Amino acid sequence: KLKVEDLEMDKIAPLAPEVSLKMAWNIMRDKNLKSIPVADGNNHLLGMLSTSNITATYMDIWDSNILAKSATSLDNILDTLSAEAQNINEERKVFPGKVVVAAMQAESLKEFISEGDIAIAGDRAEIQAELIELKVSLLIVTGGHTPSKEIIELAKKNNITVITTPHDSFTASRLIVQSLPVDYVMTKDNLVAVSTDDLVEDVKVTMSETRYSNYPVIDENNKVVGSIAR
Amino acid sequence: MVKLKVEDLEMDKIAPLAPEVSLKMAWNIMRDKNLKSIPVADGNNHLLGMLSTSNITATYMDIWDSNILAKSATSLDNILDTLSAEAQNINEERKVFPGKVVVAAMQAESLKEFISEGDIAIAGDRAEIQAELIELKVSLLIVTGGHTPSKEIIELAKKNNITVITTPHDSFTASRLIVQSLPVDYVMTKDNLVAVSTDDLVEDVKVTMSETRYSNYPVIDENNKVVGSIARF
Numbered sequence: 215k216l217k218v219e220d221l222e223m224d225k226i227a228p229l230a231p232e233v234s235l236k237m238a239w240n241i242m243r244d245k246n247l248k249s250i251p252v253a254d255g256n257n258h259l260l261g262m263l264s265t266s267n268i269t270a271t272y273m274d275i276w277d278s279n280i281l282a283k284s285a286t287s288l289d290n291i292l293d294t295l296s297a298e299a300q301n302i303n304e305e306r307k308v309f310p311g312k313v314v315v316a317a318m319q320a321e322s323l324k325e326f327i328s329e330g331d332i333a334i335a336g337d338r339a340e341i342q343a344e345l346i347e348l349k350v351s352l353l354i355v356t357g358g359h360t361p362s363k364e365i366i367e368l369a370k371k372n373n374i375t376v377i378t379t380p381h382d383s384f385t386a387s388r389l390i391v392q393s394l395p396v397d398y399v400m401t402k403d404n405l406v407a408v409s410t411d412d413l414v415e416d417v418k419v420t421m422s423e424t425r426y427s428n429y430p431v432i433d434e435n436n437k438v439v440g441s442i443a444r
Numbered sequence: 445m446v447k448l449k450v451e452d453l454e455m456d457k458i459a460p461l462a463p464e465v466s467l468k469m470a471w472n473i474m475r476d477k478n479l480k481s482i483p484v485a486d487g488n489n490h491l492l493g494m495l496s497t498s499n500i501t502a503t504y505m506d507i508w509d510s511n512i513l514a515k516s517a518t519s520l521d522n523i524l525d526t527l528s529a530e531a532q533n534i535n536e537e538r539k540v541f542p543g544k545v546v547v548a549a550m551q552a553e554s555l556k557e558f559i560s561e562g563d564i565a566i567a568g569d570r571a572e573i574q575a576e577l578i579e580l581k582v583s584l585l586i587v588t589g590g591h592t593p594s595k596e597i598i599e600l601a602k603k604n605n606i607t608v609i610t611t612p613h614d615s616f617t618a619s620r621l622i623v624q625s626l627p628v629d630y631v632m633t634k635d636n637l638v639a640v641s642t643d644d645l646v647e648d649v650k651v652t653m654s655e656t657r658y659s660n661y662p663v664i665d666e667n668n669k670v671v672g673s674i675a676r677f
């Protein structure tokens with residue numbers, strides 16, 4: 215009897231779970247993939263990423279602490295904003311608060327911005343200093359202007375991560391969402407894969423139900439070996 | 445020979461989207477009706493194109509044209525809906541907002557170096573800022589925080605014919621949401637959309653479907669009205 219491993223399959227390089235949506239989307243376009251598997255370091259299938267996932271994330275109610283819940287990393291934020299770090303709290307993995315644009319006056323920031331927040335700000339030293347004083351978990355300086363040495367020093371002392379992006383505040387706000395790791399967004403449950411072990415006749419029965427265009431293929435050990443079209 | 449035509453097949457009747465409908469509204473309809481795509485049609489219900497999550501993603505993920513409101517002729521209505529905003533003044537002779545979207549974070553005097561006649565400015569409660577934005581002849585003033593501006597500012601707007609609206613959202617949120625106001629016809633697949641006609645023979649549509657491997661195809665009738673959608677066999 216003919217098994218799935220006897221079928222020719224599409225080759226498919228899985229995404230790591232920690233890769234940004236930005237990186238993931240660039241890969242999906244580059245290969246013309248509507249969806250792509252996500253796998254761990256041992257190549258075990260973790261989930262699947264598609265533009266259905268990505269759009270739902272963008273269109274559906276934004277959790278305020280989404281960076282925290284996704285455990286979005288600094289490297290993800292830095293690549294996504296084409297940003298450079300002027301100081302890093304190297305003992306922090308996770309940015310716990312909400313993302314806020316520091317559009318206000320310095321004296322007013324207290325009311326909107328609190329400890330652990332991610333603050334997007336411009337090139338005003340006065341504003342930066344106050345955000346540092348408020349213990350934002352992350353200060354994102356927009357406009358491409360790296361803060362003064364004084365500000366950098368204040369941040370070193372307080373262990374505030376400070377980065378600078380060339381993008382203005384509107385664009386940075388749009389971009390930051392694309393920092394999210396794929397594992398936060400992907401389909402995980404009732405992902406339908408097929409095993410190299412499975413009989414084709416049985417797989418026809420399983421494809422009958424589901425209606426998807428593509429199914430990742432796994433081996434005896436749950437490792438991602440490819441995908442096949444219906 | 446009597447041959448099976450598309451009209452003989454089972455098809456999904458989908459009410460098509462009007463082209464001016466916002467991405468936000470489109471997606472709510474799509475998500476509700478469990479669609480992965482949805483046809484876009486003109487007033488005579490002729491096919492203009494198709495919307496999928498691939499179009500939407502590509503547009504949302506592309507941050508490179510700060511001028512997309514202009515290029516897309518996004519309507520004030522769409523923006524109002526998307527930002528749950530209310531208008532305080534409207535320039536009735538303007539259909540199009542021609543500049544760039546910009547968060548007005550700076551101090552009043554500095555606004556003039558980033559913000560330019562025709563721009564779309566996202567601004568806070570500060571009346572000083574609101575009035576400089578109006579003097580700079582922004583095409584659209586969006587006030588954040590649900591802070592409907594003062595009667596003074598509204599009258600300054602009236603005089604200079606600056607459209608002004610107010611959203612409950614803060615500036616980060618307004619920035620993140622505003623691209624959802626784009627009309628579907630800016631975003632939809634237009635070129636190389638593959639449709640089938642009711643009177644097409646199923647035989648010949650089987651070939652077409654093998655040449656292109658899309659999962660669904662819009663069906664148009666013998667007078668070119670959108671009559672629904674058929675699944676790949």
Ligand SMILES: Nc1ncnc2c1ncn2[C@@H]1O[C@H](COP(=O)(O)OP(=O)(O)OP(=O)(O)OP(=O)(O)OC[C@H]2O[C@@H](n3cnc4c(N)ncnc43)[C@H](O)[C@@H]2O)[C@@H](O)[C@H]1O
Pocket residue numbers: 248249262263264265266267401404405406407425426427428429430480481494495496497498499633636637638639657658659660661662
């Ligand atoms: N006639 C036409 N002419 C011109 N252009 C056209 C066209 N038709 C479509 N296009 C354009 O081209 C794009 C791709 O077209 P299509 O190739 O038709 O793809 P699709 O059906 O829209 O997406 P997909 O194949 O992933 O849907 P599925 O049910 O498998 O999966 C749906 C979702 O479920 C999830 N999923 C997928 N596989 C899964 C699995 N094995 N297990 C669990 N979940 C899975 C994924 O999140 C996925 O997003 C479209 O976005 C559209 O813009």
